[PDB]
Design a protein around this ligand. Structure first.
Ligand SMILES: NC(=O)C1=CN([C@@H]2O[C@H](COP(=O)(O)OP(=O)(O)OC[C@H]3O[C@@H](n4cnc5c(N)ncnc54)[C@H](OP(=O)(O)O)[C@@H]3O)[C@@H](O)[C@H]2O)C=CC1
Length: 470
């Protein structure tokens, strides 16, 4: 339908076995020195071999790394590639409590490589940051955030970007040869997962047309929490839920009952019959969330979460983004969603819906922070599935009418009518799909623009993008 035509999903398809020769020139491996002990880090360093130059990226100091890298580059001449193992640093940064250290260090590595004039393509490796292949388990949502950042590095610095590669749990010599072969020549691919069966690469496809009933979505009832529920998209979601008979809607935001439009929204929802609670509740404050959940009465237990809290403002190009700007974009996404997961994992929820963005699914220049933050959401929904919990992630394109533009519409990410976007969301929930993008695209505008500087294997599975590029 029209609503079906907004839904896309990510799939992973088999690509060519790589060649057998390792790279001719010298690799530079980047290690986070406090987080260099995971088995897959050892296995990758052993696969790169002992002639690989090693750089320990200590702390988060862009100017000190630029000077260290410039010396390496002077002494070695041109590297074949830079292979980052920084993703193994999952612990939170000591000064930026919503930023995984390896995410901070990956940003600063991309920055310092540019500053020093190292031009060799940067490859960011992860372990468990994607769910690729039937049955695969996304074990690290934190490393999954890195993929959101990496895709935006590829759009802002295409000439010095290699790609992303997720490693299996056991990096055997077949996996190792796949890795070193890809580093020699990746066949134009740049979003790759090495698995036992072969190498897979990431693809965007139209989602299957809706099948009513197929997901056995239970009737909306009980208490439903909508973070960011006082307005834009969260408010429209709340209205849909009230139309569909919710008993009690708990709407939160930092401003709560003081939010713009909040009183009008409460009155409109109440006219439908729904009990409304509005709370001023920072979604990343764990104690406030717990207090809100403790207030729910016996007769209206929590049945669903819709996580719409978030900001996109105060992002910046990769070359300029600060760790304090990245912490502020992460906080309502990573920190808040981690708390929502931890405090509801035992409640047997009917839905746990995380609102992501096209910035995280395909990438948007100028939005590295927002891409990382929303890629963490997508990765958490797949991780939660592996635990047997419900979860979904919905990556929006551009909304019309309400919510958070001119650049994006000009690049062919067109504004959706709210009712069509909401009806596409309902199709995803009735199917019980784990992940989708819901976006109106003009592919004839989007594909040539998005690929002007480097090809995108991601879009090869969208026939409208192939036709635009013909
Ligand atoms: N509009 C669009 O085209 C798209 C939207 N999205 C995503 O959908 C979600 C909703 O966006 P939209 O409605 O358009 O944006 P709005 O700015 O209209 O709504 C976002 C809301 O989140 C609340 N919020 C922000 N930070 C926090 C926080 N730390 N704790 C609790 N609430 C917070 C805001 O209220 P307060 O400031 O009072 O906290 C507001 O209620 C966002 O997560 C966004 O990333 C994704 C793609 C596209």
């Amino acid at each position: 339908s029209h609503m079906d035509a907004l839904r896309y999903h990510i799939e992973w398809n088999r690509v060519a076995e790589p060649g057998t020769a390792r790279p001719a020139g010298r690799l530079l491996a980047v290690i986070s020195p406090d987080h260099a002990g995971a088995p897959w880090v050892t296995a990758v360093l052993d696969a790169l071999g002992p002639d690989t130059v090693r750089f320990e990226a200590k702390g988060t100091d862009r100017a000190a790394w630029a000077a260290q890298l410039a010396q390496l580059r002077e002494d070695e001449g041109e590297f074949h590639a830079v292979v980052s193992l920084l993703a193994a640093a999952e612990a939170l940064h000591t000064d930026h409590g919503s930023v995984p250290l390896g995410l901070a260090q990956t940003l600063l590595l991309a920055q310092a490589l540019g500053d020093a004039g190292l031009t060799a393509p940067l490859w960011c490796l992860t372990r468990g940051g994607v769910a690729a292949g039937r049955g695969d388990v996304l074990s690290s949502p934190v490393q999954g955030a890195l993929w959101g950042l990496g895709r935006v590095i590829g759009l802002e610095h295409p000439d010095r970007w290699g790609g992303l590669i997720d490693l299996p749990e056991t990096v055997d010599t077949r996996a190792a040869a796949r890795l070193t072969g890809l580093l020699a020549d990746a066949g134009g691919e740049d979003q790759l997962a090495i698995r036992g069966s072969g190498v897979l690469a990431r693809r965007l496809a139209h989602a299957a047309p809706a099948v009513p009933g197929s997901g056995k979505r239970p009737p909306v009832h009980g208490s439903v929490l909508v973070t960011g529920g006082t307005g834009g998209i969260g408010g429209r979601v709340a209205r849909r839920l009230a139309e569909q008979g919710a008993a009690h809607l708990v709407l939160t935001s930092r401003r709560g009952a003081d939010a713009p439009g909040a009183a009008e929204l409460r009155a409109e929802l109440e006219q439908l019959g729904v009990r409304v609670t509005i709370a001023a509740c920072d979604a990343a404050d764990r104690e406030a969330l717990a207090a809100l959940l403790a207030e729910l009465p016996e007769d209206a237990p929590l049945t669903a979460v819709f996580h719409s809290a978030g900001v996109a403002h105060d992002d910046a190009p990769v070359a300029d983004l600060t760790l304090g700007q990245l912490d502020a974009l992460m906080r309502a996404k990573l920190t808040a969603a981690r708390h929502l997961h931890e405090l509801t994992a035992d409640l047997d929820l009917d839905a746990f819906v995380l609102f992501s963005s096209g910035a995280a699914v395909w990438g948007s220049g100028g939005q590295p922070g927002y891409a990382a933050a929303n890629a963490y959401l997508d990765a958490l929904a797949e991780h939660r599935r592996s635990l047997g919990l419900t979860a979904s992630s919905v990556a929006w394109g551009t909304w019309g009418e309400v919510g958070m533009h001119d650049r994006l519409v000009r690049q062919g990410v067109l504004a959706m009518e709210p009712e069509h976007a909401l009806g596409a969301l309902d199709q995803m929930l009735e199917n019980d799909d784990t992940a989708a993008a819901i976006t109106l695209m003009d592919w004839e505008m989007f594909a040539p623009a998005f690929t002007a500087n480097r090809p995108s294997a991601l879009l090869s599975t969208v026939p409208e993008a192939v036709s635009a590029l013909s």
